[PDB]
């Protein structure tokens, strides 16, 4: 594994995090690729992409994804000014993170339709430190753990909807775990 931090290898940005409960190890690999295994996992995120991200980035992704438990897996970012949280996510285990969440619509891209929802983290860490803030999330119906993912179509949808971006921050393909297990592999370019 590689030590939690954030930093570029073979020309990607990458973000590793997790809550130092143990049972999740990240690795980089050549070109776009990053692997990561978990067994009775705390809470982490991981991947590869840029920083900062766009807003008409046309982001390739494939590999393999097994989860066992609560993960994801989706293009992560941030934006500033409105500070916002957001995915799109491709793939999940067993619990679908817009589970109880508003839905602010639909849009359609690269083979599917995706389900359009906001929700709010109230006083928790950010990149700016504890702030409020919403998340926005479009969530793929058909499942899938290669493709392309045409952000701009999320970006302008979630704009029709009211669900303004600011300026990017990062921009990641991304596995998310929340106390699980799992194993995945993924090459972003």
Do not use: C
């Amino acid at each position: 594994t590689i030590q939690p931090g954030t930093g570029y290898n073979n020309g990607y940005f990458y973000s590793y995090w997790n809550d130092g409960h143990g049972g999740v190890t990240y690795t980089n690999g050549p070109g776009g690729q990053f692997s990561v295994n978990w067994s009775n996992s705390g809470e982490f995120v991981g991947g590869k992409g840029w920083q900062p991200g766009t807003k008409n980035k046309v982001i390739n992704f494939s590999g393999s994804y097994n989860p066992n438990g609560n993960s994801y897996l989706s293009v992560y970012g941030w934006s500033r000014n409105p500070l916002i949280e957001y995915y799109i996510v491709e793939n999940f285990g067993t619990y679908n993170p817009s589970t109880g969440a508003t839905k602010l619509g639909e849009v359609t891209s690269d083979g599917s339709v995706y389900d359009i929802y906001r929700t709010q983290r109230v006083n928790q860490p950010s990149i700016i430190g504890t702030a409020t803030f919403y998340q926005y999330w479009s969530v793929r119906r058909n499942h899938r753990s290669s493709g392309s993912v045409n952000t701009a179509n999320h970006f302008n949808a979630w704009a029709q909807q009211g669900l303004t971006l600011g300026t990017m921050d990062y921009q990641i393909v991304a596995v998310n775990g929340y106390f699980s297990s799992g194993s995945a592999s993924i090459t972003v370019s």
